[PDB]
Amino acid sequence: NKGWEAALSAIEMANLFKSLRGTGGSGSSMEIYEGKLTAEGLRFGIVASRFNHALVDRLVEGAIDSIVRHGGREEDITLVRVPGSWEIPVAAGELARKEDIDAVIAIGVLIRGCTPHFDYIASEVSKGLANLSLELRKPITFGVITA
Amino acid sequence: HGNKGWEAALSAIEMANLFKSLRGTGGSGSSMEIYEGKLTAEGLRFGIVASRFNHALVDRLVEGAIDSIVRHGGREEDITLVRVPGSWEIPVAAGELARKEDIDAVIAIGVLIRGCTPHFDYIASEVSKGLANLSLELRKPITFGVITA
Amino acid sequence: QAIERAGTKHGNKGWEAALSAIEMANLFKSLRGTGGSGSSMEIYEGKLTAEGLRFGIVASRFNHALVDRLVEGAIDSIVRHGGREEDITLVRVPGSWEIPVAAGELARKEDIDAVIAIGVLIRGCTPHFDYIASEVSKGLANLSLELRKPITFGVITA
Amino acid sequence: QAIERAGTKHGNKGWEAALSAIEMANLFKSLRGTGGSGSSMEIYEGKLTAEGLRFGIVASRFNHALVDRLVEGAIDSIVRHGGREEDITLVRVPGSWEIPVAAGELARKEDIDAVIAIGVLIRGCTPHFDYIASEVSKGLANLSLELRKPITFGVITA
Amino acid sequence: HGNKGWEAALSAIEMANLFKSLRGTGGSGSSMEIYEGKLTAEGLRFGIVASRFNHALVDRLVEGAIDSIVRHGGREEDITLVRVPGSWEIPVAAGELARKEDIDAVIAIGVLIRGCTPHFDYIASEVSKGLANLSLELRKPITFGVITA
Amino acid sequence: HGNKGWEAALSAIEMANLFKSLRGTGGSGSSMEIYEGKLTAEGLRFGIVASRFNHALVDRLVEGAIDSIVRHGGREEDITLVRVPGSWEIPVAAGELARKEDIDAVIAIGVLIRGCTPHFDYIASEVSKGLANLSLELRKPITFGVITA
Amino acid sequence: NKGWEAALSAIEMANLFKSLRGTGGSGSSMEIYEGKLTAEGLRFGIVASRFNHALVDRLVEGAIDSIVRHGGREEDITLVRVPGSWEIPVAAGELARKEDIDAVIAIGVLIRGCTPHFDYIASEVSKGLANLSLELRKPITFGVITA
């Protein structure tokens, strides 16, 4: 279930960035920065599409379960629904600019298989999410699948 | 001694020296100027970003990178190592290290899932593109030690 | 050594790349100048006189045999068209991946009128999409538009 | 490091090569011994007990990932069949071309009962005749016949 | 009667007799000398070297070899059978048998992988080469009963 | 710094050291012995054999070989250079150098005429075979710096 | 004309080996051994086949002309004819064991083209000549062609 995996990646970036922005080490050894798998005290945001209802519900199911099971507090989740995959990047941008969220998770299902004639919509969705993460300096996990 | 981790470190060391020369005082003229970087790692600060897929392989590349830096005069106390889950999200971590003024170069190490070979994958395209844009924007070398399974 | 010098280098991609840089450098210098009075359609084209211009060259070291013939091709194009060898800056980089970042540093100097990028690319013996080759073209194109200074593309496939 | 140790290496070409060396070493030791009394057809076969035998291994360094799993496969085959780790001599060489000459030096020692050669070969993506691969096979075969000591062939193609 | 093991045994018997006659002093003259070997195995010692790989087929080949020797007057007491792991080490074992002064001929039996090679095979070429060189150096007949799958 | 001339010199230097270790006194035991050669060229004597076809290319490889030896501690006075017309006749010249007791290794450099590609050429086969036999017979490293056009 | 080229290679090995066996240098610089293109005072031997009479005569023509033109003395050439290419190695062996010859030249024409099904006779001729040169430590030039 990609939903469980995508949530796990987000948890362990919210911890990593929290460590990096903190005070540095004492020197005298090679600094190593790391992210644990404890979600206590963290705020998340989820953006999910509405296409292939059967599949997406299972994915959003895993994401919420993963956050709570790893110690998260269910009141710290904001869920946003959008008509289709083309509208995920713009919604994620709005949710990522709030100062109360630490990571964002994108859930969706693409239409054509793994052997198309190339897909423009799929490229734009992945391309847009990547630029937002770099521009806003905030992790954004990528949890879409292919039909 | 011949792994991609070793090679990536050399390119990072050399480019770091070359940039230090370019923005220094120019030559006296009267002849064609030639700029090239040395392989003296003394006084340089490095950061490394490594993924986690294939824990066996990635550990090997990271060890090679550290070995290369120290053998060429690098001080082991000047290496910052950041570890990340997958290849999709090296660029965001690399960006954080590059924006520090105490880092002279960044090395990215990872392994990609070889999917359907003839066709176009989106994770590989985004990881390479993101690193390239960061280097041009921040004006700082970023080496691409990535490989394929 | 004399055997190396005896070979001809007119016409290789180093020659064409340098020639394009000379024309573009003169063309821009004309555009920034005062506009014509009018009374007719006004045409612009760059002359091929290279005296007084400053050039920069970025070349990778991979495949040390092919590259050298390309770099020497570029230099002779500038010299044979009137340029002086004292107005050329040469920068060498480990590989094709880091050409764009080095080319950016040269292009930001106010003493450079154009930049020439030379290199070679490894061709896998089956036609897949190369993630390194695309980044070089993408990076160089962006730099020229942003800095508003011509940059010429002089790479080849093995 | 523990991740490396957890992997299984039973059955790789390092395993088979070592196993053949053990059998041949015992077989020769039987042939040199006194012949049977007679009265029936007399059969020889080598046992798989490795206690008391000395072994030598020659391995190239090209493709450092593949080779290590092969060398460790050979060592565990000797140990798991009764051999001691103090009776193994390991020699490392730059490349596959100089395996035969190094293997010759080890084979001439009187304290060695068998030699194992391990390496990998580069496969060009079109099937031509390889002048390096043939020389390794030719050299190793000649050494065994001339020195009258078994040598086992444990190379693979990439 | 129809397997290569049977044929290999007959060749070994005939060559062993032929060598026995050649060492004899030449004739008086008055005609053209003709030398040939007979097919009686009485009083001759043989050795067999067989590989274990693809054992389903070789047992039938070794079967024929022993059957032929006995059928043609050979005493089963005089056969020495040696087994080796694979075909790569047939030559080295054959050399040890051929150097015994109590052996008149040696028979080598084995099976090689499919012969649809691009241009060449590097293991098959060594078995035949080694046996041929060994026979000439030691001046003793060695028969090739190897077949291709 | 990355030409076949450079690589061939390294292999010659390393193998020369390794042989010096093997025939010296053995270890104390109680642990597995590992033998490997260093990259210290001090005190070693080298000979080089170079063909003449493509004078431009061969000169480059020969310069690289000399540069590699000296940079790793080699004394320029300990290099003997022999030049020959074509590839067919490197082995006979290499044999003469190898038989001197003052030479520790030999390096062979040349370029072959790429004929009809898929098929078998006899000049290339003989040059490689001859070098291999010489090393085994004389028990001395001989490196193969040869390339193809 | 391969005949001219084959003779030239032999001339400049008889000189090289003459230099190598001579006294060494004075040190203080990198020893370089070299062979000139002067054939004065040298003895040669030629072994030629008798198949494709038209072609071989032209090749033996060039070899003798090359030796004399580069200063050789025509009385110092020994010519041996053999029925076919298969008999070249054995004849060359006899001529190379004499102590009065400095180099040997082999001239011949092979039968099948450059794209056969592999040729056993061609391989043996080249293989045999190479072994003789190494075993006897004396240059032997290879001047055959393919029909």
UniProtKB/Swiss-Prot annotation, chains C, D:
One of its GO terms (biological process) is riboflavin biosynthetic process. It catalyses: (2S)-2-hydroxy-3-oxobutyl phosphate + 5-amino-6-(D-ribitylamino)uracil = 6,7-dimethyl-8-(1-D-ribityl)lumazine + phosphate + 2 H2O + H(+). Keywords: Riboflavin biosynthesis, Transferase. Extremely thermostable. Has a melting temperature of 119.9 degrees Celsius. Its EC number is 2.5.1.78. GO terms for molecular function: 6,7-dimethyl-8-ribityllumazine synthase activity. Pathway: Cofactor biosynthesis; riboflavin biosynthesis; riboflavin from 2-hydroxy-3-oxobutyl phosphate and 5-amino-6-(D-ribitylamino)uracil: step 1/2. (2S)-2-hydroxy-3-oxobutyl phosphate binds at residues 5, 125-126. The active site is at residue 128. HAMAP family: Lumazine_synth. Belongs to the DMRL synthase family. Catalyzes the formation of 6,7-dimethyl-8-ribityllumazine by condensation of 5-amino-6-(D-ribitylamino)uracil with 3,4-dihydroxy-2-butanone 4-phosphate. This is the penultimate step in the biosynthesis of riboflavin. This is 6,7-dimethyl-8-ribityllumazine synthase. It comes from Aquifex aeolicus (strain VF5). The gene is ribH.
